[PDB]
Enzyme design. Sequence first.
Site, mmCIF file in Angstrom:
data_model
loop_
_atom_site.group_PDB
_atom_site.id
_atom_site.type_symbol
_atom_site.label_atom_id
_atom_site.label_comp_id
_atom_site.label_asym_id
_atom_site.label_seq_id
_atom_site.Cartn_x
_atom_site.Cartn_y
_atom_site.Cartn_z
ATOM 1 N N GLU A 35 36.948 30.217 39.552
ATOM 2 C CA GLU A 35 37.206 31.324 40.501
ATOM 3 C C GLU A 35 37.004 30.834 41.945
ATOM 4 O O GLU A 35 37.852 31.145 42.786
ATOM 5 C CB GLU A 35 36.307 32.513 40.171
ATOM 6 C CG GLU A 35 36.732 33.265 38.909
ATOM 7 C CD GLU A 35 38.108 33.908 38.928
ATOM 8 O OE1 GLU A 35 38.751 33.902 39.989
ATOM 9 O OE2 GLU A 35 38.536 34.387 37.860
ATOM 10 N N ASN A 46 45.407 38.838 47.009
ATOM 11 C CA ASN A 46 46.278 39.146 45.855
ATOM 12 C C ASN A 46 47.624 39.655 46.372
ATOM 13 O O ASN A 46 47.686 40.169 47.483
ATOM 14 C CB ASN A 46 45.598 40.141 44.915
ATOM 15 C CG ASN A 46 44.286 39.617 44.369
ATOM 16 O OD1 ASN A 46 43.298 40.351 44.272
ATOM 17 N ND2 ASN A 46 44.259 38.334 44.054
ATOM 18 N N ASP A 48 49.218 42.226 45.660
ATOM 19 C CA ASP A 48 49.205 43.711 45.715
ATOM 20 C C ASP A 48 48.482 44.183 46.978
ATOM 21 O O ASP A 48 48.411 45.411 47.159
ATOM 22 C CB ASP A 48 48.565 44.326 44.465
ATOM 23 C CG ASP A 48 47.058 44.167 44.357
ATOM 24 O OD1 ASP A 48 46.483 43.366 45.116
ATOM 25 O OD2 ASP A 48 46.469 44.852 43.537
ATOM 26 N N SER A 50 45.278 43.563 47.732
ATOM 27 C CA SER A 50 43.815 43.526 47.486
ATOM 28 C C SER A 50 43.347 42.094 47.786
ATOM 29 O O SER A 50 44.211 41.218 47.927
ATOM 30 C CB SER A 50 43.459 43.963 46.083
ATOM 31 O OG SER A 50 43.967 43.034 45.129
ATOM 32 N N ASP A 52 40.127 39.122 46.635
ATOM 33 C CA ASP A 52 39.013 38.690 45.749
ATOM 34 C C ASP A 52 37.968 37.972 46.608
ATOM 35 O O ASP A 52 38.366 37.127 47.474
ATOM 36 C CB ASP A 52 39.502 37.719 44.677
ATOM 37 C CG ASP A 52 40.442 38.298 43.641
ATOM 38 O OD1 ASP A 52 40.652 39.534 43.643
ATOM 39 O OD2 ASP A 52 40.902 37.500 42.787
ATOM 40 N N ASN A 59 37.368 41.791 42.987
ATOM 41 C CA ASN A 59 38.626 42.350 43.544
ATOM 42 C C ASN A 59 38.312 43.673 44.254
ATOM 43 O O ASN A 59 37.674 44.540 43.627
ATOM 44 C CB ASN A 59 39.657 42.538 42.431
ATOM 45 C CG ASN A 59 41.045 42.816 42.962
ATOM 46 O OD1 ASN A 59 41.198 43.108 44.143
ATOM 47 N ND2 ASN A 59 42.058 42.697 42.112
#
Length: 129
Positions: A35, A46, A48, A50, A52, A59
């Site tokens: 990660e 992301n 969309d 969003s 992380d 998220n």
Amino acid sequence: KVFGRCELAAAMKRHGLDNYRGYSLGNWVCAAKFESNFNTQATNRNTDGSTDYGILQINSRWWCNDGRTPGSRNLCNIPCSALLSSDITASVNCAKKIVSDGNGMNAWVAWRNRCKGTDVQAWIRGCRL
Ligand code: NA
């Protein structure tokens, strides 16, 4: 902060992640490796819109507030910035909520694709825990 492998294992165990919801410490260190490469300041956008945040790439869609994710929730009741601290307490507290949400560590797609079913104990091999 960039943790060492055994240093992060130690921090996670101290914060009670080891065997949390039945996931051995190796699974958590493996997830953190892929990660964030153990970097507490890791952020990734992301598609969309969003973002992380942190060692476990939590998220803003569901778990933290970053003020820029329309229609999102903040189910861990924290600013996403707190997930970037050299102290991993907020990340661990919120990862306990995520892993309890019903799909266990499958919520971490890098865990599912790069850690699940693998020799995850290798990640804590030789650590003084
Ligand atoms: Na949010």
